[PDB]
Structures are given as structure tokens and as C-alpha cells.
Design a protein around this ligand. Structure first.
Ligand SMILES: NCCc1ccc(O)c(O)c1
Lengths: 272, 344, 58, 339
């Protein structure tokens, strides 16, 4: 009955993400491949906050899922689909930045630019559907009013495909982008230009750190809670699950408040 | 209707060709070349251009049409000057040439009849006299050359060129496009040397240029022309540099600055070392410190956080010019891509 | 003496223009209005043309 | 000596011209038109959008059939559009992509273009092959071409950034008449309805009325402070209007030898890139650097309406001969047809 204290999280997730969508939809300066991937991320966060989080609150209010079984199967499927889509959008953003540095001539164009954005967004939503799809039938094995994902056939598969592979992708790519930025920094060698590189060597760390801290403890618990008898009370599992959505609340700021064009778009939107 | 479908097929063919051309055209690097005098512009262009048959192979129909239009001009000279042909029949041939020109058919395939009549016209002493009186009626002497060789222009059907003048395009003046490649990048350098006109009106057309290459001479630190009203080349170079650096259309366009004639500069600074242009300069009377001061004078004109100036000192015999531009372009593109992501 | 030839050309141009006849502004304005009024009913931007007649709306 | 006498005579002649001007400048259109109704609010909408250019559009011109529109952009492609269906009719590659002006012949047989290469290129649109090729190149200018307009199939008027205009014989490929007297670069031309007179606007802001057959400047007009970017004629041939970098448009009458009206507004801080009139001459249209085109009531010096569908500076305007449609083009690579 204290689930309603999570209401502000929903309000925050939607608010920040709508600003991102409007920042792009109300502006033309913000028409880049990174801005399109950022909007896709904002959409995944808006959909998890709108379609999943109110039911997370309903379930926390009353621990018994006093609703239909079909509704739960849909809720669970959307929860997985939207969280997976958000993570995969983070991967798409990281790889687009890699292309931007590793192959500057392919990034700075219009035809291959549109093709890369179309392919990355499509593959993100295709994989999120494919991964969550098995939860629409059979394997959920829900019992009475409890409809929590706990089937190893899906839990291990989903954890590996939705997180660990995407996880290892961004960190190596982000580190490699840093290796390239650092090796060029040490050759180009007035203080601000090194400082601008330094902000990059700090902003990359921010993107990686928030991703790692928000999703890592959930998926370890997610597998461990089924793997063996262990000290995982429902309060810890739920706390990590909520942290997973906190990541969705965080994304709009680390992705859009460092970009001056987004700051200007936000000031226009906010009448500031 | 069938007519509308035919129109749609033509429209689709046009759209397809426009898209394919846009796709290939976008894969390039655009560089604008500026300076405030003769400077090192010609030196940097010659050095960058380490296409040679490209124009030669492509202008055959142009030389051909110039040859025929000129021959018609000669016929006009014939009647204007009062120079008659020995064979009056050739006057009818002269009329044919004028009709070819007036019908706008001088770019069309050259028939046997046109060759026979034009060769008959060319061998007449009155056509050579028309050139002898070219001072009264203006005739194209290059076309004269091609007319002397007209038998080859006609009988061969196609030949890239008969002259290495490259049509000269001396009157073309205007903008001179230099195309080249290096490593994996293609470049188009726009040597805008002939635009003796107001820059405000034509500068905007280069707003989307990848980078601006600006060439100044170090030896100009004390070089004053009478046309400069006591001002030296260094100050004219700095004033133009500042004008372009803060131009509203180039706020985020990076500049690659070449300081040329470093040898003449180093030798000249033995006497009056940088005192003449920068009387306030204080420091060792050396090549390195005078050069550092001058470069600082150019560096100080960059007032945009999203712009940088690349500097390199050159010598006419110093061939390390293509790699410098290549590297500067690479860093400019990377910086622009990094700002797209917002990393940096 | 190039500036003298230029001054001569300027003087001749001004002497020519100085002898051009002129009409009153109120008359020119009245004629301009008369033209606009006479054809006002004919101008598709002042009198919108119905879609059955307007080739861009049909 | 002689130089000072000639300079003083020139000053006396300018003073005499100014006084001759005051002799007639005792009325204004802005007062005489207080006796007529306003056009009211004009709410034009786009009916067609023309897509295809991949670069800033610099020139556009309507043909005499009100159906075929020609445009040119930095892509180096001159495109002929069917304004009713959006179907493309022609795409002409250019030998030089630095194109700033174009025109459509009144006969529908020829088109022209030019720019920073100082060459005016005339193309033949009616061929046996079905392809379009260069019919002529007009060389002899020493600066960029700012405007080209056809008088007839065999005669074209050019204006360049060489302080001069010229009348060219297309069939011969040579200049036949030159128009001198400008000091700054000349930005635009407009031809009279009867082809016998034309006007030009210059950086020095002195627009001039030229006699096509005489080869001399017949009238000099002043009023702007900065460069004049666009000029057009009033449909009856007795008046013209100019736009400048002063965010001002001015209407002049050739027989009055006077400026009749000034078009300005407190909220316009962008210059004028194009000026045109409606068939009746009642509406004056001007393109601006704030990504829109204002429609002015030419007899009121007020705002009739605004066309504001562009994302970049407006570069060209035109009106059909019958007044049925207004076309615009801008640096955003799109063309629009307004009705
Ligand atoms: N509720 C957090 C989202 C979630 C839940 C289960 C999963 O297997 C998964 O990959 C993601």
C-alpha cells in the first residue's frame, strides 16, 4: 500500500523522456543519427513508464495479482520487451559513436547515415520483441496470484541476450573509443582542447557507469534467485527491479543535458 | 492515362539519376583557398596537385564548336572588312558555316560536306588576310590553329586535343577547381583567384565547405607595395584572416593556415627582425621566436569555441603539404562528429 | 588624367538625365491604382478561384 | 583645374536633378490610396511541394505557360518541373555547379544559367534527340553573373559582378551592346513588358533604367542605403520595385522619376532576397532572410499576409503570367507552390 511512493518515478521517467522527444520533434538543429537513437531510447523509457510501471505499482500495492492471467502475461512481456529495448538502444548509441570516431567518413554523410539509423533502430525493436515473445505463452508457469518470471529456460536466455552480451558490447567499444581519443590526445597536444578531450574521457565513464550500476545487480540476482538456494529476500529482488527503471529515469539527463543543442531545445520547451 | 504514365516514367528516371549523382557527389572533401595577395596560393596549389587527360578528353566537342563558331566569325570579318575570296563559290560555303552557327548546330557531328566546304574556305588567301586584319574584326587565334588542323579535327571524328593549352580558359578566370585524392580521401580545392568583386555577395556559396585553407607569407612582414598605401602584406593578411575568421557564414568552419616563404623570412629577419610590422614585438632576433610571434598574431583571431586554426610553416621546396592538409581535415571531421554525439 | 575623363562621363550623364521630362507623383499614383483596380477582378490572388477552376485545387 | 570644374558641374547637375525631383514629389501613394479598400487578409496555402534538389536553391523562373517551372541549385542541376503534377520534365547537368541565376525563354525553347564561372550558358530544350545540351556559352564577363533574362530567342541580357550589364546575341555568341555606369557589383535585372527597357540594381544602391536599343542609362534612381538584391517591374511597365539589405522595399515610377512608396516594418531585421508582383500589381511579394516571404499590399504599404513554410533563407520568388500561383524557393532545397 506504499507502492504509490513510486509514482514520482513514473512522473520523472515520462517527463524527462517527453522533453527529449519534444527537443527533437520541435527542433531541426537536432537532426542527427545520435539524436534519432536518443529519441528511440526515450520512447523505450516512455513505454516502460506508461505500460509497465503502473502495473508494477498495482502489484506492489497488493502482493496478490488480483487481475486476469492474460493481463499479467502481457504485463510481463512488455516489462521485458521495454527494458531490453532500452538497453539495446544504449548499445546502438555506443556503436554509433564508435563509427563517428573509428570511421569518420561514414558517419558524416546522409545516405549511409539514414541506412545505419534505420537498421539500428529496427534491430533494437526486433530483438526486444524476439526476446520477450516466449513470455506470451506456456513457460511462465504462473500460479494463483503470483506471476513473476522464474523459469530457467527463459531467465538464463533472457539475461544473457538482453544484458550480458549488450553489456560487454558497450564497455569494450566505449573503452576502445577512449583508447582512440587518448592516443590522439597525446599526439595533437590550448588548455581547453585537452580539457574538451577530458570531458569526453569523463562523459564516457558516466554513460558506462550508470548503465553498469543500474542493470548489473538485477541480472545477477535474476539468475541467482533461480539457480540455487540463497539469501535473496523479495525486498532485495524488488529493490533491484526498481533500480532497473531508475536507469530509465536517468538516461534523459546523461544523454541530453551535456549537448548544448538539447539544452537550448529544453529552454525553449520550458520557456526558460 | 498512358501519357501521364509516360511522364511518370521520365520523372522516375530523372529522380533516379539525381539520387545516384547525389550519392557519389557527397563522398568528398571541400576546401576553400584564400589569401590577401599572390602569397603562397600558387605554391600551395602546385604542391597539393602532386585529371590530366580528364579535361583534354572532355573538351574535344568544345574545341570543335569553337572552331566552327570562329570560322563563322571569320566569314563575318570577310564581309565586314571587304576581303574577297579568290573563288567566289567559296562565299556560298561561307554562308553554310554561318548557318551552321546561327542554327546552333556547331556542336553536331561534322559531315563530309562541312569538311569539304570549310577546307575550301581555309585555303583561301582572304581568310588568312581576315586574320591579318584581326585587329579590326576580332578573331580567335586558337581557333585559327584548329582550322589549320581542321582536316584532322574532321577526318578523325574524335581526338582529345591538338594543343596543351587546355583551352587556356584565360578569360575564364573565376573559380579554379583543383581535384585530387590522397590516401582514402577525395578533395576539391576552390582556388577563388579571379573574383575581383565583393566577397560578401559570393562568400555564402562556400558556407558548407569542409575547411578553409588560408595562405600568408612570412616574408611579407616588411613588404610594402605602392598599391598598399604604406601597409605591408602581413597586415593585409591579418586583416583578411580576421574578416574571414569572424564571418557569420564560417563561425564553425576550421582554418588551415600556411605560413609560406619561411626561408626568405629567416634570412630577412637578420635586419630589422619583425620591427617593421609589429613594432611592439620584443624577443630574440631569431627565426623561431619571430615565427612564433607571427603565428600567435594569427591564432589570436579565432574567437569561436568550435573552431581551431592549424598552422604549418612551408617552403616552396618543402613538399610536406598534402599530409598536413589531410591530417587537419581528418581532425576537423572527427571534431565535428564528436560534437554530433556531444562527446567532447 | 583618367579622373578627368571619368568626370566628363559623369557630367554628360547628369546633363542628359537633367533634361528628362517629369510628371506629378499624384498622377503616377493615380495611374498605378487605376491599373490595379481595372484588373483586380482578374487576379487569382485577390479573388480566390474555386477548385473546379483552380488547376492546383481540382 | 579641369577635374575640379567637372566635379563642381556634376554637383550642380545633381542638385538640379534633386530640385527637378522636388517639383513633382509633392504627393505620395501612401496618401492617395487612403480612398481605396484594403485587400484584406490573404491566407495562401501550399498546394504542391517540389522535391529533388540536394543543395541550396539559388534561382527559379516561371515559363509563359504558367505550367513549367525551372530552378537551379548548388548541385549543378537545372531542373524543369511540371507544376501541376510535380512530375519532373528535365534535369540538365551543368559544367559548373556554382550557379546563381537562371531564366526561361518566353517561347519555351531555351533556358539559361550562370554564376561564379563568369559564363552564361544557353540550353536548347527542343531537340530531335530528346536530350538537352548546351547551345551556347557567352564569355566576356569579368565577374560573376547575378541575373540573366531573355528578351527573345536570339537575345539575352546579362548582369555581372564587373559593374556592367550586356546585351548578347545568342546565335552569334558575342556581345552586341554593353551597359556601363555602375560602380559596384550589379545584383539583379528586370525586363519591361515590351522588351525595350530594362532596369538593374547595384551594390551602390543606384538602380538604373536602361534603354536596350540605345545602349545607355536613361534614368538613375536612389533611395536605399545598402546593396539592392532584387528588382522587378510593375505589370504595366511604368513602375518597378527594389529590395535591399536594409530590410526595405521601395516602389518607383519611371515617368514620375520618383520613389512612390517605402515598404518596411519594425519586426523585419532580415534583408530582401527576391521581389515580385501579382498580375494586377496589387500585391507585392518579397522573400526574406528570416525563412519566410511577406505579401504586401502594393498600394497600402502594409502586410497582406505571410508565407512561412521554409526552413532556410528564401532565395527566389515568382508569379505566373496569369496570377494563378506563386512559387517560392529557398536554401532548404525545396520549392513550394502557393495558392
Ligand atoms: N523487470 C526487469 C526487466 C527484465 C526482467 C526479466 C528479464 O529476463 C529481463 O531480461 C529483463
Amino acid at each position: 500500500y506504499y507502492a504509490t511512493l513510486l509514482t514520482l518515478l513514473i512522473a520523472v521517467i515520462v517527463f524527462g523522456n517527453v522533453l527529449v522527444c519534444m527537443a527533437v520533434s520541435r527542433e531541426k538543429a537536432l537532426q542527427t543519427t545520435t539524436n534519432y537513437l536518443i529519441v528511440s531510447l526515450a520512447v523505450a523509457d516512455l513505454l516502460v513508464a506508461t505500460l509497465v510501471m503502473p502495473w508494477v505499482v498495482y502489484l506492489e500495492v497488493v502482493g496478490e495479482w488480483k487481475f486476469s492471467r492474460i493481463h499479467c502475461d502481457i504485463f510481463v512481456t512488455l516489462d521485458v520487451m521495454m527494458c531490453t529495448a532500452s538497453i539495446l538502444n544504449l548499445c546502438a548509441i555506443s556503436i554509433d559513436r564508435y563509427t563517428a570516431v573509428a570511421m569518420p567518413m561514414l558517419y558524416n554523410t546522409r545516405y549511409s547515415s539514414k541506412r545505419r539509423v534505420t537498421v539500428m533502430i529496427s534491430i533494437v525493436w526486433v530483438l526486444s520483441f524476439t526476446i520477450s515473445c516466449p513470455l506470451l505463452f506456456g513457460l511462465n508457469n504462473a500460479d494463483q496470484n503470483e506471476c513473476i518470471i522464474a523459469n530457467p529456460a527463459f531467465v538464463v536466455y533472457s539475461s544473457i541476450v538482453s544484458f550480458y552480451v549488450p553489456f560487454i558490447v558497450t564497455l569494450l567499444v566505449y573503452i576502445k573509443i577512449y583508447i582512440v581519443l587518448r592516443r590522439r590526445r597525446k599526439r595533437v597536444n590550448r588548455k581547453l582542447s585537452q580539457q574538451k578531450e577530458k570531458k569526453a574521457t569523463q562523459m564516457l565513464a558516466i554513460v558506462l557507469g550508470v548503465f553498469i550500476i543500474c542493470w548489473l545487480p538485477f541480472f545477477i540476482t535474476h539468475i541467482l534467485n533461480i539457480h540455487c538456494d540463497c539469501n535473496i529476500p523479495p525486498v532485495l529482488y524488488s529493490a533491484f527491479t526498481w533500480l532497473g527503471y531508475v536507469n530509465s529515469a536517468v538516461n534523459p539527463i546523461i544523454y541530453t543535458t551535456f549537448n548544448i543543442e538539447f539544452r537550448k531545445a529544453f529552454l525553449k520547451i520550458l520557456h526558460c | 492515362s498512358a501519357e501521364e504514365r509516360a511522364a511518370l516514367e521520365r520523372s522516375k528516371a530523372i529522380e533516379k539519376n539525381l539520387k545516384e549523382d547525389g550519392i557519389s557527389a557527397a563522398k568528398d572533401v571541400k576546401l576553400l583557398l584564400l589569401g590577401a595577395g599572390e602569397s603562397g596560393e600558387s605554391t600551395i596549389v602546385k604542391q597539393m596537385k602532386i585529371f590530366s587527360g580528364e579535361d583534354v578528353k572532355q573538351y574535344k566537342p568544345v574545341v570543335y564548336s569553337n572552331t566552327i563558331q570562329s570560322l563563322a566569325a571569320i566569314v563575318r570579318a570577310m564581309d565586314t572588312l571587304g576581303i574577297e575570296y579568290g573563288d567566289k563559290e567559296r562565299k556560298a560555303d561561307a554562308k553554310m558555316v554561318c548557318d551552321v552557327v546561327s542554327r546552333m548546330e556547331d556542336t553536331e557531328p561534322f559531315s563530309a560536306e562541312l569538311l569539304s566546304a570549310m577546307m575550301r574556305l581555309w585555303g583561301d588567301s582572304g581568310i588568312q588576310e581576315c586574320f591579318n586584319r584581326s585587329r579590326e574584326y576580332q578573331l580567335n587565334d586558337s581557333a585559327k590553329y584548329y582550322l589549320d588542323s581542321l582536316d584532322r579535327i574532321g577526318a578523325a571524328d574524335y581526338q582529345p586535343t591538338e594543343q596543351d593549352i587546355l583551352r587556356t580558359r584565360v578569360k575564364t578566370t573565376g573559380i579554379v577547381e583543383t581535384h585530387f585524392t590522397f590516401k582514402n580521401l577525395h578533395f576539391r580545392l576552390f582556388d577563388v583567384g579571379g573574383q575581383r568583386s565583393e566577397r560578401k555577395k559570393w562568400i555564402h556559396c562556400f558556407e558548407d565547405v569542409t575547411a578553409i585553407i588560408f595562405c600568408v607569407a612570412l616574408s611579407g612582414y616588411d613588404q610594402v607595395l605602392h598599391e598598399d598605401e604604406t601597409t605591408n602584406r602581413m597586415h593585409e593578411s591579418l586583416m583578411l584572416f580576421d574578416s574571414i575568421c569572424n564571418n557569420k557564414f564560417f563561425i564553425d568552419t576550421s582554418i588551415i593556415l600556411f605560413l609560406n616563404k619561411k626561408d626568405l623570412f629567416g634570412e630577412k629577419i637578420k635586419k630589422s627582425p619583425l620591427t617593421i610590422c609589429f613594432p611592439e614585438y620584443t624577443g630574440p632576433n631569431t627565426y623561431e621566436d619571430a615565427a612564433a610571434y607571427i603565428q600567435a598574431q594569427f591564432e589570436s583571431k579565432n574567437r569561436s569555441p568550435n573552431k581551431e586554426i592549424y598552422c604549418h610553416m612551408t617552403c616552396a621546396t618543402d613538399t610536406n603539404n598534402i599530409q598536413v592538409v589531410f591530417d587537419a581535415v581528418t581532425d576537423i571531421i572527427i571534431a565535428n562528429n564528436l560534437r554530433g554525439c556531444g562527446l567532447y | 588624367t583618367a579622373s578627368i575623363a571619368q568626370a566628363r562621363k559623369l557630367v554628360e550623364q547628369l546633363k542628359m538625365e537633367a533634361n528628362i521630362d517629369r510628371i506629378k507623383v499624384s498622377k503616377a499614383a493615380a495611374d498605378l491604382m487605376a491599373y490595379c483596380e481595372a484588373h483586380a477582378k482578374e487576379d487569382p490572388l485577390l479573388t480566390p478561384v474555386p477548385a473546379s477552376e483552380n488547376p492546383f485545387r481540382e | 583645374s579641369e577635374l575640379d570644374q567637372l566635379r563642381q558641374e556634376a554637383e550642380q547637375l545633381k542638385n538640379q536633378i534633386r530640385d527637378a525631383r522636388k517639383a513633382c514629389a509633392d504627393a505620395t501613394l501612401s496618401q492617395i490610396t487612403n480612398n481605396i479598400d484594403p485587400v484584406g487578409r490573404i491566407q495562401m496555402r501550399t498546394r504542391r511541394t517540389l522535391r529533388g534538389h540536394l543543395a541550396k536553391i539559388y534561382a527559379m523562373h516561371w515559363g509563359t505557360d504558367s505550367r513549367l517551372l525551372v530552378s537551379a541549385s548548388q548541385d549543378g542541376k537545372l531542373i524543369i518541373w511540371d507544376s501541376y503534377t510535380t512530375n519532373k520534365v528535365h534535369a540538365i547537368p551543368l559544367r559548373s555547379s556554382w550557379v546563381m541565376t537562371c531564366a526561361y525563354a518566353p517561347s519555351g525553347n531555351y533556358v539559361a544559367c550562370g554564376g561564379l564561372d563568369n559564363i552564361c550558358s544557353i540550353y536548347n530544350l527542343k531537340t530531335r534527340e530528346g536530350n538537352v545540351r548546351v547551345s551556347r556559352e557567352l564569355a566576356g564577363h569579368t565577374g560573376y553573373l547575378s541575373c540573366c533574362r531573355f528578351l527573345d530567342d536570339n537575345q539575352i541580357v546579362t548582369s555581372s559582378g564587373d559593374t556592367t550589364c550586356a546585351l548578347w546575341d545568342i546565335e552569334t555568341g558575342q556581345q552586341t551592346t554593353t551597359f556601363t555606369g555602375h560602380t559596384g557589383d550589379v545584383m539583379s535585372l528586370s525586363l519591361a513588358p515590351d522588351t525595350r527597357l530594362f532596369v538593374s540594381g547595384a551594390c551602390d544602391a543606384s538602380a538604373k533604367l536602361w534603354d536596350v536599343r540605345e545602349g545607355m542609362c536613361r534614368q538613375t534612381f536612389t533611395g536605399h542605403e545598402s546593396d539592392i538584391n532584387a528588382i522587378c517591374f510593375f505589370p504595366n511597365g511604368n513602375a518597378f520595385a527594389t529590395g535591399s539589405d536594409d530590410a526595405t522595399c521601395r516602389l518607383f515610377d519611371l515617368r514620375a522619376d520618383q520613389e512612390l512608396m517605402t515598404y518596411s516594418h519594425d519586426n523585419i531585421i532580415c534583408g530582401i532576397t527576391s521581389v515580385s508582383f501579382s498580375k494586377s500589381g496589387r500585391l507585392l511579394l518579397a522573400g526574406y532572410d528570416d525563412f519566410n516571404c511577406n505579401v504586401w499590399d502594393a498600394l497600402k504599404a502594409d502586410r497582406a499576409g505571410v508565407l512561412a513554410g521554409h526552413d532556410n533563407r528564401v532565395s527566389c520568388l515568382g508569379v505566373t503570367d496569369d496570377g494563378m500561383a506563386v512559387a517560392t524557393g529557398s536554401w532548404d532545397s525545396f520549392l513550394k507552390i502557393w495558392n
